[PDB]
Design a binder for this molecule. Sequence first.
Ligand SMILES: *CCCCCCCC
Lengths: 40, 5
Amino acid sequence: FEIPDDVPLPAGWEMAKTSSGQRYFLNHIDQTTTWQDPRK
Amino acid sequence: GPPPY
Ligand SMILES: *CCCCCCCC
């Protein structure tokens, strides 16, 4: 929840789900994974 | 615990 589509994601940043909707975002420019942050 | 890539 708390994650509308008012804005897309950041460049060089893939995404992936590791659980029940755990769409953790894959930072490409830095090669890393982080929960919600860029979207919301 | 951050997930892998
Ligand atoms: C389930 C309690 C531990 C989860 C926090 C660890 C995040 C890496």
